[PDB]
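**User:** I keep going back and forth on a fold encoding question. It is easy to fool oneself when nobody else works the same problem. Could you pick a protein and write out its sequence and tokenised fold? Could you put it straight underneath, so I can go through it closely?

**Assistant:**
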Amino acid sequence: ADVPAGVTLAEKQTLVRNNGSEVQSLDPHKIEGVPESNISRDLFEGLLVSDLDGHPAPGVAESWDNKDAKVWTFHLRKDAKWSDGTPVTAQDFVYSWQRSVDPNTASPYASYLQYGHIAGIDEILEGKKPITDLGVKAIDDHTLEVTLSEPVPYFYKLLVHPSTSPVPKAAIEKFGEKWTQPGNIVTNGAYTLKDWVVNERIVLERSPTYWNNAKTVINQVTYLPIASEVTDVNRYRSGEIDMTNNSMPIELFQKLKKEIPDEVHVDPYLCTYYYEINNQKPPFNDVRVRTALKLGMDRDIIVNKVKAQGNMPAYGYTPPYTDGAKLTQPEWFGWSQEKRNEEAKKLLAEAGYTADKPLTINLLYNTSDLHKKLAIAASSLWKKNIGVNVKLVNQEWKTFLDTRHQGTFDVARAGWCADYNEPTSFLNTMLSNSSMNTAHYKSPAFDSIMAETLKVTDEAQRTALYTKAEQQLDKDSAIVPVYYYVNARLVKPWVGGYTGKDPLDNTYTRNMYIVKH
């Protein structure tokens, strides 16, 4: 943290944040959600970190080199330490990246290092080659060399994501899944774990072994799992919570801006809200059916519920404002909604679904006052607009996520947030082979476009090809885009060091501090 001159710190440096829901895991190879990453970023530290403006900055790596964006050398700082007092080494990295790609780990982010195309990775992920063939090596204890199979000029930007953090072999091998329990866990970041009360709180404590401990100010942070946006704001206003999660109650946002205007932050956020179609579940293996669901949704009715917050209606998957995106709007986006409806019912009818022989659908969503109102609207619009009956089904966050991977749903509420600020952070999740493809979308056409992006000579060419990919994704109606996100949350006037200026919102507790009050 960087506390400005003139500020008087409080004696008690503690922070309470709502994290939105109970985490999947504190194992960095066993997580895929925003809540998971948010705690992970306080516990473990990879080669690089996000600075206060979203940019990549030194982490364990103090400096780095690259040849043709294909061989990357990272020089690890000599004072990087585990909560053990033991050194964080290059071999820790080799071990951890290997583990991330082992089929036996079954990581939901197994594919993340494949987005950077480390040598040897495709066959390893399919189980045809051992993990020790991965193109990552420790030249010495403080020098990691990564060899990619082609040039990827943005490879470094991946390396801030928690799935790429190092993890402790010895703890993992002694304790199996219990390695992350308070007494067992060994950590790399500004904090370690003090307590974990399932469905109540995760409490972390400052670690004096952290190389940059001198700059840390907060001594204890508490993460809560409140899925109720209303309960979140309630317990903020009553004094318990210092920072709400970044999802607001639709009916209360304007009261809040009128009442505590200086505590309401709203910043750009590179995430997309959409209704994910299970492309492998009949009748949604039929492109005409997917297209009818997409066109029949009335995005302007939906965004008009959150218009105070400034959300823009979505026409694709990757956010238009992502770095390197210059997207086009498809022709359907310019129609009236009545013409979109007409088209949709013609398409349904062509597939065999008529007035008299109507489609009935299940809409899955994770517990949330926000998702529940928007699911009730979605189901009502779809009925009126295209004659599809939609029933609601709600699951807890951990179970929600698992269900989508298993395929046991028709359509679901969904949200993807960039892991790095580049369009492949979204587009790669729609690859046939991706551990994150919960769409179950498989298009050899899409895939081959994406391969082309790393054969081109210029960034402008790459940018043009991402717009082809999006177009192909939309022509296949892989998803129902609804709106682009905003990062809106409440933050107490005494909490310092939250700028809101990273559009991926990768904040760290080691950057905040509490002003005397």
Summary: The first strand starts at residue 14 and ends at 18. The chain has three domains: 1-44+169-270+487-517, 45-168, 271-486.
